[PDB]
Amino acid sequence: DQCIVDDITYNVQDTFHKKHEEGHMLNCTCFGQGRGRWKCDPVDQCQDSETGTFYQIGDSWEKYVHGVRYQCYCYGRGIGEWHCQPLQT
Amino acid sequence: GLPGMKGHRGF
Ligand SMILES: *[C@@H]1O[C@H](CO)[C@@H](O)[C@H](O)[C@H]1NC(C)=O
């Protein structure tokens, strides 16, 4: 048995990643089990409040808020924890 | 919580 997801074929016991339509990342598993069954879980990741954009652990991004430019970073730590800092030289 | 996904032939 196999799994078919987005025109991709996986073997039973295969694991892979997949981007949800909403934009967040998933970790997935192919079970097959007669019907090519597969499941995907929301990965530990960060979601920007303003932009609603998703960032992965280790990712860094910038944003302008009230004319101030920040560098942001996704720590995750099991709670999609992320922090930002004002640009400095 | 964020949604996951599941699938299988005949879905
Ligand atoms: C996703 O990863 C977690 C461990 O971080 C694992 O326990 C879970 O089974 C995975 N989900 C799927 C559907 O593969």
Residue numbers in the entry:
A (entry chain B): 516 to 604
B (entry chain F): 260 to 270
Sentences from the paper on this structure:
To examine the binding of a collagen 1/10 site, we determined the crystal structure of 8–9FnI in complex with peptide AN. Thus, the molecular basis of this association is the strand extension mechanism commonly used by complexes involving FnI modules, including the high affinity 8–9FnI-BN complex. In-depth comparison of 8–9FnI-AN with 8–9FnI-BN revealed a striking similarity in atomic interactions. Interestingly, the collagen peptide in both 8–9FnI-AN/BN crystal structures displays a 90° kink just C-terminal to the consensus 8–9FnI-binding sequence, stabilized by hydrophobic interactions involving the Phe92 (AN) or Phe794 (BN) side chain and the peptide main chain.
Fibronectin (FN)3 and collagen, two essential components of the extracellular matrix, are key players in diverse cellular processes, including adhesion, migration, growth, and differentiation. FN is a high molecular weight multidomain protein composed of three conserved module types (I, II, and III), individual structures of which have been elucidated previously. In vitro, however, 6FnI1–2FnII7–9FnI binds strongly to gelatin, the denatured form of collagen, but not to triple-helical collagen fibrils; 6FnI1–2FnII7–9FnI was thus named the “gelatin-binding domain” (GBD).
